[PDB]
Amino acid sequence: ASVATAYLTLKADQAQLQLTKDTLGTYQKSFDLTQRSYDVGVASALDLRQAQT
Amino acid sequence: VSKQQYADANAAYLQSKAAVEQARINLRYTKVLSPISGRIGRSAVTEGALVT
């Protein structure tokens, strides 16, 4: 039982790690777009700061 | 603030200043000034007369 549950937790953690990698890629794209909007002059610095957080 | 948020507010301020300028012109008309220098004649209308 312990070996089975440990292998299942490993597989579940690997899948959740892939999904958090996708979340990090999405947040990187969104932060780059807000950085472009702030560098152009349309968005203020506060909208950049919240995307940074 | 973003520079667009400064630019449109500056544009609204300039528009309100131009409206103040036009109201100042209409206030300058009601004290009617002589457009040239020279000899004046008679006043064909006196005080109390309505003009359009």
UniProtKB/Swiss-Prot annotation, chain A:
Belongs to the outer membrane factor (OMF) (TC 1.B.17) family. The outer membrane component of the MexAB-OprM efflux system that confers multidrug resistance. Functions as the major efflux pump for n-hexane and p-xylene efflux. Has been shown in one study to be involved in the active efflux of the autoinducer N-(3-oxododecanoyl) homoserine lactone, thereby playing an indirect role in quorum-sensing; but has been shown in another study not to be involved in efflux of this autoinducer. Over-expression of the pump increases antibiotic and solvent efflux capacities. This is Outer membrane protein OprM. Induction: By growth under severe iron limitation. Disruption phenotype: Disruption of MexA, MexB and OprM significantly reduces active efflux of N-(3-oxododecanoyl) homoserine lactone/3-oxo-C12-HSL/PAI-1, but not N-butyryl homoserine lactone/C4-HSL/PAI-2. Changing residue 41 to A: Abolishes complex formation. It is found in: Cell outer membrane.
